Amino acid sequence: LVHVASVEKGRSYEDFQKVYNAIALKLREDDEYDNYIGYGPVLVRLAWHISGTWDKHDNTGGSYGGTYRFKKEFNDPSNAGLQNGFKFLEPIHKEFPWISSGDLFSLGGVTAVQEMQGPKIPWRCGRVDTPEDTTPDNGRLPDADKDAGYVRTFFQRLNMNDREVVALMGAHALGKTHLKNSGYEGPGGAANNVFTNEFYLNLLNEDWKLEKNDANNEQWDSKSGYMMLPTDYSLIQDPKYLSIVKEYANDQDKFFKDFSKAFEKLLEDGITFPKDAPSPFIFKTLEEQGL
Numbered sequence: 001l002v003h004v005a006s007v008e009k010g011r012s013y014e015d016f017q018k019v020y021n022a023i024a025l026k027l028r029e030d031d032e033y034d035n036y037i038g039y040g041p042v043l044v045r046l047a048w049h050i051s052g053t054w055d056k057h058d059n060t061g062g063s064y065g066g067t068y069r070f071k072k073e074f075n076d077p078s079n080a081g082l083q084n085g086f087k088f089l090e091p092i093h094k095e096f097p098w099i100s101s102g103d104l105f106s107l108g109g110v111t112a113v114q115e116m117q118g119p120k121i122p123w124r125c126g127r128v129d130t131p132e133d134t135t136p137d138n139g140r141l142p143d144a145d146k147d148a149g150y151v152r153t154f155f156q157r158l159n160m161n162d163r164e165v166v167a168l169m170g171a172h173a174l175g176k177t178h179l180k181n182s183g184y185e186g187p188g189g190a191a192n193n194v195f196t197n198e199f200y201l202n203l204l205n206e207d208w209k210l211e212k213n214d215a216n217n218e219q220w221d222s223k224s225g226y227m228m229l230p231t232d233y234s235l236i237q238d239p240k241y242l243s244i245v246k247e248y249a250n251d252q253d254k255f256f257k258d259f260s261k262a263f264e265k266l267l268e269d270g271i272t273f274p275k276d277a278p279s280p281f282i283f284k285t286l287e288e289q290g291l
């Protein structure tokens, strides 16, 4: 399967910076969502789940085709709760009907991270919508109730290595688990709509307790009111993972730099970019624009 990036006709940096600003302006406006967390965390989760279907072996799945717009992927049990990120973006797609679905879902994730004061993420245009029959089947996204060997093995399919996996998981400092979506409940920290390295700090400094929640699932709970998933706590159980966790709890700039590279790579897996294709765009935030 080859998927070649095709820039939307005649579009350039300024067009996509207009779509960025539209998403970012609505993130500021619709602030009440999920008890004032706002839409940013569900939008970086949506960009991860449309990319996380990729399989390196046959180049199926991935962010290129925008296939989450089809019922099979929209109704995947693993995507429960992401309909709220879709409905947030649907106004903006009506306003810029020329951007492809893959591009709009991935730029929403980029915009949310930078607007929640994360690192800049280089983003590239050119994903092309593909037919309903290209939609990957349910079951390619990871279970939460498993251990470190499962996480390592699952992420080899998206060929991410240990460092990349640990840098990507730092995004679980954002938002929260919702019992009616996943059977898990609670936030992982106090700053859950500002991008920081707090996931790593909480993992190493809190007093975790294995408890059973109302959906009868086990999760790691702390006195402070935070929770960690079994696959999250996995990172301090494995010796290779645990020493990268310590590296990111001791250096927030290295965390930001490595997250930026692994999230771009995540979003680009499966796509062939021609050598005459434009460079990756670095978008300015509303704040850097005085907007």
Ligand code: HEM
Pocket: 041, 042, 044, 045, 048, 080, 081, 142, 143, 144, 145, 151, 168, 169, 171, 172, 174, 175, 176, 177, 178, 179, 181, 182, 183, 184, 229, 231, 263
């Ligand atoms: C083995 C890996 C992973 C598993 C099992 C997993 C699982 C989960 C689960 C069960 C939730 C709760 C969903 C809900 O109830 O609403 C969640 C939320 C979230 N995850 Fe993951 N995740 C994984 C990796 C990642 C990665 C790599 C990213 C992003 C780079 C990510 C970003 C998020 C975000 C931002 C949320 C919060 C959503 C919200 O607030 O609504 N996840 N994760």
